[PDB]
């Protein structure tokens, strides 16, 4: 069939990793870019490389690719990972607590807290799946 | 040959030998 | 012919801020560069080839043969080692075995027989090595007795610096690999024996890493 | 980038044997074997026969 080899996939991965603002979706334009910027000693290898670059960018403008890393999808992840909320999501106005751990906290270092309320336990104990 | 039928053969040979000795009185 | 140390222990050794390999043995640090020992132990480190046993693996056409070389190394007043390497021809097998023998040398301590006068000469206790079926036992001997054994543990014991010993082997000792590794296990288990000679509670000194980490961060990454 | 030396003939014995010594890079197929490697086959007139040399 038509399965690419190590040299085509590796060369395509490094030319997308090193260049993104010059390469595009049209096969002839990035084919001529791969002529100019990369040293390819043949033509079939050049065409296979340019075709895999076209397919890889058709993947990239849809979603992320785990094999390579380019600057535009870089630091959008760090913007996503460096967010802050308004409320800290831990200093809520009421915290539910079980009677057993409430009695544990009564003997630990405190007698009563200002932000806890005792709930009611279950009427029965059935907590494992039927296995035997 | 396997041990079972060899033991059967040697039983038959021993029976024939015992018969010949008891008829050689 | 130039040393480029990959580990930080090799850089600490090469920059000449450690004293001996005794602190390395005290802290039980792994040694993965063979010629750190060649830096420490100089012309006193001699090797003799024990056995070259050829092995075969049968294939599509014929049997592909390979040579496994045993060598023992060590200075005659201390440390002793043993290394095994199997490769295609003989010379690179011997070279790799010498490298693995220099890589793994163990220290020895020597005791006395009755009266503790002068330098030690014999094994301090009744140590025992075990690998495969070969069971090698080393017993202390009086002064001037000499190493009485099979020739392979005899030459290993003169290489290890032990002068007087009583041995008693058991099992299929014709296999030289099991025999040599069993007597090497018997010799190497000598410090791993608690006697009332050293019952005092030890003092913990600083590791070389935490005391020369300023040199490490100033020199390399 | 590579070399391969093989010595063929009889070597310390009646039965002949071949000892191949190779390290580095060595290609065999295609057109790039023609204009990269150089191969010479010579002979040695030993006292017990003729010895073969193939270097590349």
């Amino acid at each position: 069939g038509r399965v690419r080899t190590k040299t085509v996939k590796k060369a395509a991965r490094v030319i997308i990793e090193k260049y993104y603002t010059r390469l595009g979706n049209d096969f002839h334009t990035n084919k001529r870019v791969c002529e100019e910027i990369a040293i390819i000693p043949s033509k079939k290898l050049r065409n296979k490389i340019a075709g895999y670059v076209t397919h890889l960018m058709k993947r990239i403008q849809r979603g992320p690719v785990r094999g390579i890393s380019i600057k535009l999808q870089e630091e959008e992840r760090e913007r996503r990972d460096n967010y802050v909320p308004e409320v800290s999501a831990l200093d809520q106005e009421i915290i539910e607590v079980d009677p057993d751990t409430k009695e544990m906290l009564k003997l630990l270092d405190f007698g009563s807290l200002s932000n806890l309320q005792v709930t009611q336990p279950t009427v029965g104990m059935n907590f494992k799946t039927p296995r035997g | 040959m396997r041990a079972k039928w060899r033991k059967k053969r040697m039983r038959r040979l021993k029976r024939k030998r015992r018969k010949m000795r008891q008829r050689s009185k | 012919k130039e040393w480029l140390p990959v580990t930080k222990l090799g850089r600490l050794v090469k920059d000449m801020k450690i004293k001996s390999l005794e602190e390395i043995y005290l802290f039980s640090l792994p040694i993965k560069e063979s010629e750190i020992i060649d830096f420490f132990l100089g012309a006193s480190l001699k090797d003799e080839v024990l056995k070259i046993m050829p092995v075969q693996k049968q294939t599509r056409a014929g049997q592909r043969t390979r040579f496994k070389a045993f060598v023992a190394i060590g200075d005659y007043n201390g440390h002793v080692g043993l290394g095994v390497k199997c490769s295609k021809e003989v010379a690179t097998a011997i070279r790799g075995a010498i490298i693995l023998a220099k890589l793994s040398i163990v220290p020895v301590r020597r005791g006395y027989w009755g009266n503790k006068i002068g330098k030690p000469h014999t094994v301090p206790c009744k140590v025992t090595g075990r690998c495969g079926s070969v069971l090698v036992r080393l017993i202390p001997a009086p002064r001037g007795t000499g190493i009485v054994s099979a020739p392979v543990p005899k030459k290993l014991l003169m290489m290890a610096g032990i002068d007087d010993c009583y041995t008693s082997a058991r099992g299929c000792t014709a296999t030289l690999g099991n025999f040599a590794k069993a007597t090497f296990d018997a010799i190497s288990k000598t410090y791993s024996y608690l006697t009332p000679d050293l019952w005092k509670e030890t003092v913990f000194t600083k590791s070389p890493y935490q005391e020369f980490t300023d040199h490490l961060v100033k020199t390399h990454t | 980038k590579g070399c391969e030396v093989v010595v063929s003939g009889k070597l310390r014995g009646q039965r002949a044997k071949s000892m191949k010594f190779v390290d580095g890079l060595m290609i065999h197929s295609g057109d790039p074997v023609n204009y990269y490697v150089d191969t010479a086959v010579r002979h040695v007139l030993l006292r017990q026969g003729v010895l073969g040399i193939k270097v590349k």
Binding site: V84, I95 | - | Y209 | -
Partner: protein, 217 residues
């Protein structure tokens, strides 16, 4: 590690622990975790004593601050829960992070490019990360583990009993370890509140990311 009167939880830490849910553990119990259990409540959930967790966290903080080079501490995580938390820990305390695919041979093979030589190791789960523990055992290298009530306690030296199944509990334990290390180092004042944002250690699945991006700008 709590023998004084300045190294204990006052009010906020217990509330954070109760909010994240670090007191409740797994259904199963290991035999080496009978120490760090108060009592089994209903529905087969074990309750972790918080004072023992605080003492073990203080001991691990002492172990981290005990060495002076911050780069020699290596922090490993492989699961998707503690991904951002270990990176924020290495950003705060100067450690070296390995987040995602701890490849084998990094502690034993000196030809591989990721050959690190650390002095102290901190992991997230001994059950999931059984691979850094064996490579830690192959050299002389102690480790720190945030252990649950059912993790196999083996080859570890400071086991901090907590909840490693929820993202909030993992992120909270990482944040308290970071602030304890920074307080013992002296770079962070003790009386002033350093509770700026504990949410930076909290992972969220990408459907929540799209929901947050649709709700906010």
């Amino acid at each position: 590690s709590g023998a004084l009167d300045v190294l204990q939880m006052k009010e906020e830490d217990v509330l954070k622990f109760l909010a994240a849910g670090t007191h409740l553990g797994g259904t199963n119990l290991d035999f080496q975790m009978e120490q760090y259990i108060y009592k089994r409540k209903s529905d087969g959930i074990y309750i972790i004593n918080l004072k023992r967790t605080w003492e073990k966290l203080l001991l691990a903080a002492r172990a981290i601050v005990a060495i002076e080079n911050p780069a020699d501490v290596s922090v490993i995580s492989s699961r998707n829960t503690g991904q951002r938390a270990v990176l924020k820990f290495a950003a705060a305390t100067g450690a070296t992070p390995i987040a995602g695919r701890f490849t084998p041979g990094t502690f034993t093979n000196q030809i591989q490019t990721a050959f690190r030589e650390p002095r102290l190791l901190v992991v997230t789960d001994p059950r999931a990360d059984h691979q850094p523990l064996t490579e830690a055992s192959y050299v002389n290298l102690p480790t720190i583990a945030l252990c649950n009530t059912d993790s196999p306690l083996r080859y570890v030296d400071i086991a901090i009993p907590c909840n490693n199944k929820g993202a909030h509990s993992v992120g909270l334990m990482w944040w308290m370890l970071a602030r304890e290390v920074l307080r013992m180092r002296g770079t962070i004042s003790r009386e002033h509140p350093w509770e700026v944002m504990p949410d930076l250690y909290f992972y969220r699945d990408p459907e929540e990311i799209e929901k947050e991006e649709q709700a906010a700008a």
